[PDB]
Amino acid sequence: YADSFVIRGDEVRQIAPGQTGKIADYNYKLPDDFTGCVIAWNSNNLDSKVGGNYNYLYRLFRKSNLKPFERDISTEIYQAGSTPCNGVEGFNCYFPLQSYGFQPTNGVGYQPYRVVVLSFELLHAPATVCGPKKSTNLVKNKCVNFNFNGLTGTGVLTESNKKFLPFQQFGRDIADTTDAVRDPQTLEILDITPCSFG
Amino acid sequence: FASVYAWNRKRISNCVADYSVLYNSASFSTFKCYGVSPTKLNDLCFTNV
Amino acid sequence: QCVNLTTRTQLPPAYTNSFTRGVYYPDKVFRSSVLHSTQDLFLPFFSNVTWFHAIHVTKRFDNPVLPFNDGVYFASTEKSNIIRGWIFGTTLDSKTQSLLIVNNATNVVIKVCEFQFCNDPFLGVYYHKNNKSWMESEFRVYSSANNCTFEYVSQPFLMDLEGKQGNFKNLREFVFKNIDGYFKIYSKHTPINLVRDLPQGFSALEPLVDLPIGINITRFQTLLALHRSYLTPGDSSSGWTAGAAAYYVGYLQPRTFLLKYNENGTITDAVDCALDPLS
Ligand SMILES: *[C@@H]1O[C@H](CO)[C@@H](O[C@@H]2O[C@H](CO)[C@@H](O)[C@H](O)[C@H]2NC(C)=O)[C@H](O)[C@H]1NC(C)=O
Ligand SMILES: CCCCC/C=C\C/C=C\CCCCCCCC(=O)O
Ligand SMILES: *[C@@H]1O[C@H](CO)[C@@H](O)[C@H](O)[C@H]1NC(C)=O
Ligand SMILES: *[C@@H]1O[C@H](CO)[C@@H](O)[C@H](O)[C@H]1NC(C)=O
Ligand SMILES: *[C@@H]1O[C@H](CO)[C@@H](O)[C@H](O)[C@H]1NC(C)=O
Ligand SMILES: *[C@@H]1O[C@H](CO)[C@@H](O)[C@H](O)[C@H]1NC(C)=O
Ligand SMILES: *[C@@H]1O[C@H](CO)[C@@H](O)[C@H](O)[C@H]1NC(C)=O
Ligand SMILES: *[C@@H]1O[C@H](CO)[C@@H](O)[C@H](O)[C@H]1NC(C)=O
Ligand SMILES: *[C@@H]1O[C@H](CO)[C@@H](O)[C@H](O)[C@H]1NC(C)=O
């Protein structure tokens, strides 16, 4: 998954696990068990006008911090005082969202940055992205180094009788080593046996 | 502010440290704590500040 | 199109025991001929689950708003396709985002936007004798849907909708979890032949889907189908017949289980490591 947004230049440090601040508290929270990358680049040449760019908003008030990967798009009046506001936005009752003012003559810390957060998992389930690596043929009954969907190893591959459910790709033994694998092109199950013995 | 060679030191005591009030009027380019986690600062209580 | 139904009788709640029900595959790894210890959100063994029905003749259309504490085990015994889906959310009143999973007579629809749900959301099937058919007629769930974020619609089909008269022939079990903005659904279908009181046995639920919805969920509600025909005069709020279905609700907690995989890779038994000292 790819999450995209635009923030201020000073707040790019807040896109990380275990951070505090208004972006990490009220707008976008990363899990502590995060796997993936965060990418950010300056976009002062596209998101700022000479009069100002008030298209990008952010939440400034909230009753509690967000949960990881949770999104709040509500626009109820935030009661900061000791009186019901009845949704009229008076004194001590604020509108929750405010606007970034992006002008091309801002300091670098106030210029807009575009942020993309890529999130994925590795080496447990069937995958469909892969990289630029190129495949080879299947050599069975010999000692080979293998790379199956990114999982590397060494051993002997043989035809198997195990039968995986459709949501399974790898098989593990009691010592938690991978001993079976589904070939990603022929969809056949193979057993992986070590090479040294005796 | 003071010059770095004659930096200033101020004592802080007897006040609630609700730093969320800095969200509207301040934007810091560097913020790093040592010995504590930023997500725990709201539950703690500080000595000799 | 949104009505407050009537002609409903009063009754206290009913409870039942869960005889080692509600176990699911906790990863996507294949294991064979082994005993594996796992900690996760499970439904404890011999738990007190709540029982809801809907038999008319007495009318009983149960669909209250129930909590969604940490996850939900949901089971449904039916013969004529009465439970159609659920709605999940916190306020369910268009001030916050909500998730809707529904089964029309033709598609499965998943939508995560801002709904204004009714006090009594339902669907409705109409029965003609002149024409030889039960047909899907009403869909009265929400009034508005403004700022949608996620949407999925399955390939078209057509269900049966025909009202049977035998015994409960289909058991469908679901586990709903909500973590890191992912709504995970595990599911299992089983053929049964039963009259009441959710049965005993062991079957492990397999992973169905992970939806990236990213909303807060604290309550949920079930969507039932109505029956209207030439024998239901009423106007539109008293002229309805319920049907026959039952569903049971229980809540998950973090437990340690010991699962048993046979040689074919299927989970066939489990031990709840905190039920007794024996376990
Ligand atoms: C992946 O591509 C290979 C070819 O690059 C496909 O292999 C073909 O499989 C069919 C079986 O239905 C054989 O009749 C062909 O001779 C195969 N081609 C070659 C070049 O060996 C394979 O089917 C593709 N993967 C999928 C899922 O279709
Ligand atoms: C006199 C000053 C108050 C002294 C309070 C003492 C301890 C409180 C602990 C931490 C305060 C951190 C303030 C900076 C908040 C920046 C938030 C952010 O954008 O990341
Ligand atoms: C979920 O909604 C409830 C509404 O009762 C709210 O109190 C709670 O704070 C929300 N979740 C979070 C993490 O704030
Ligand atoms: C349904 O009943 C509720 C009160 O429980 C009421 O607020 C609402 O306006 C009623 N709506 C209709 C259509 O009767
Ligand atoms: C379930 O809990 C209720 C709570 O009062 C209790 O009355 C009922 O006896 C319990 N059921 C079982 C089977 O323990
Ligand atoms: C069922 O509801 C979905 C929700 O929009 C709709 O797209 C679909 O067309 C409906 N079913 C039929 C048969 O029209
Ligand atoms: C059956 O007849 C009913 C009217 O009684 C009509 O509404 C419906 O569309 C008809 N369906 C078919 C398949 O003829
Ligand atoms: C949701 O709807 C309201 C009112 O129609 C609108 O102000 C708001 O911008 C909408 N949400 C988004 C994300 O556009
Ligand atoms: C799986 O094992 C069962 C007994 O537990 C057996 O009846 C069945 O034939 C096996 N499946 C096969 C044939 O792979």
Which of C99, C85, B27 lies closest to A71, judged by CA? C99
Tokens 């000791």 found at? A82
Phi-psi region of A45 (alpha: psi -120 to 50; beta: other; left: phi over 0): alpha
Q: How far is CA C118 from CA A129, C3, C97, C145, C235, in A?
A: 42, 8, 15, 13, 19
SS3 A154: strand
Report CB contact under 8 Å: B27, A60: no
Cα A32 to Cα A51: distance, rounded to the nearest angstrom = 40
Is residue C1 domain-resident? Answer: no
Q: Are A58 and A102 contacting, i.e. CB atoms less than 8 angstroms apart?
A: no
Amino acid at C102: V
**In this structure, are residues C87 and C72 in contact, taking their beta carbons and an 8 Å threshold?**
no
Q: Is residue C8 part of a domain?
A: no
State the residue for tokens 């009143």: C93
| Chain C contact partners (≥3 CB pairs within 8 A) | A
**How far apart are the C-alpha atoms of A104 and A50, rounded to whole Å?**
6
Q: Considering the domain boundaries, does residue C2 fall inside one?
A: no
Is residue C96 in a domain?
Answer: yes
B38 touching A (Cβ < 8 Å): yes
With a CB cutoff of 8 Å and minimum separation 6, the contacts of C119 are: C4
Tokens of A101: 């003012």
Look at chain C and report how many structural domains it folds into: 1
Count, in order, helices (H) and strands (E) of chain A.
1, 12
Q: What residue type is C110 in one-letter code?
A: I
Q: Which residue of A20, A60, A109 is in closest CB contact with B41?
A: A20
Q: Are the C-beta atoms of residues C32 and C259 closer than 8 Å to each other? A: no
* CATH number, position C267: 2.60.120.960
Question: How deeply is C185 buried, as exposed, middle or buried, from its count of CB atoms within 10 A (0-12, 13-18, 19+)?
Answer: middle
List CB contacts (< 8 A) between A173 and chain C.
Answer: 34
SS (H, E, C) C166-235: CCEEEEEEEEEEEECCEEEEEEEEEEEEECCCCCCCCCEEEEEEEEECCCCCCEEEEEEEEEECCCCCCC
Whether the CB-CB separation of A26 and A81 falls below 8 Å is answered with no
Whether C119 is in the pocket of ligand 4, judged by its Cβ within 6 Å, is: yes
In a domain, C23, yes or no: yes
Is C168 a member of any domain?
A: yes
Q: What is the resolution of this structure in A?
A: 2.7
Spatial CB neighbours of C239, under 8 Å, sequence gap ≥ 6 = C228, C232, C233
Distance from the B6 Cα atom to the nearest Cα atom in chain A, whole angstroms:
28
Q: How many angstroms away from the CA of B1 is the closest CA of chain A?
A: 21
Relative to beta strand C29-30, strand A170-172 is parallel
Q: Both ends of chain B: CA-CA distance in Å?
A: 19
What is the experimental method? Answer: cryo-EM
In total, chain A counts a number of residues equal to 198
* Cβ atoms C202, C270 nearer than 8 A: yes
CA atoms A173, A175, A179, A184: torsion sign: positive
Measure the CA–CA gap between B39 and B47, rounded to whole angstroms: 18
The set of residues, in sequence order, having a beta carbon less than 8 Å from that of C77 and lying 6+ positions away, is C168, C170, C171, C192, C194, C198, C245, C246, C247
Count CB atoms within 10 A of the CB of residue C187. Answer: 16
CA dist C90 → B26, C216, C219, C246, C258 (Å): 34, 7, 6, 25, 34
C266 is written with which tokens?
């299927």
Closest CA to C245 of C47, C102, C51, C16: C51
Alpha carbon distances (Å) from C217 to B13, C212, C221: 41, 13, 12
CA–CA–CA angle C55, C57, C63 (5° rounding): 30
Residue A17: which residues within 8 A CB-CB, separation 6 or more?
A30, A31, A32, A34
CB A20 within 8 A of CB A58: no
Residue C248 lies in a domain: yes
Chain A residues closer than 8 Å to C264 by CB: 163
Quick check: C206 and A165 CB within 8 A? yes
Residue with tokens 């043989």: A158
Going across the sheet that includes C204-212, the strands are C14-18, C47-52, C245-251, C72-78, C168-179, C182-194, C204-212, C23-24
**Residue C178 and residue C211: Cα distance in Å, rounded?**
9
Strands (DSSP E) found in C43-131: 47-52, 66-67, 72-78, 83-89, 98-103, 108-113, 115-128
| Residue A10 phi, psi dihedral angles, 5° rounding | -80, -20
CA distance A33 to chain B (A): 15
Residue A28 CA: distances (Å) to CA of A74, A165, C180, C213, C217: 14, 36, 12, 14, 18
Residue C9 lies in a domain: no
- Out of C30, C182, C216, closest to residue A170 by CB: C30
Residue range of the domain that includes C275? 14-279
Rounded Cα distance, C247 and C14, in Å: 11
**CB-neighbour burial class of residue C84 (10 A; exposed 0-12, middle 13-18, buried 19+):** buried
Assigned token pair, C217: 């969920």
In this structure, which ligand is nearest to the CA of A128? 1
Rounded to the nearest angstrom, the gap between the alpha carbon of residue A79 and the centroid of all alpha carbons in its chain is 33
Q: Which atom of ligand 6 is nearest to the CA of C111?
A: 4
Exposed e or buried b per residue across C86-121, where buried means at least 16 C-beta atoms within 10 angstroms of its C-beta:
bbbbeebebebbbbbbbbbbeebebbbbbbbbbebb
**Rounded Cα distance, A55 and A52, in Å:** 9
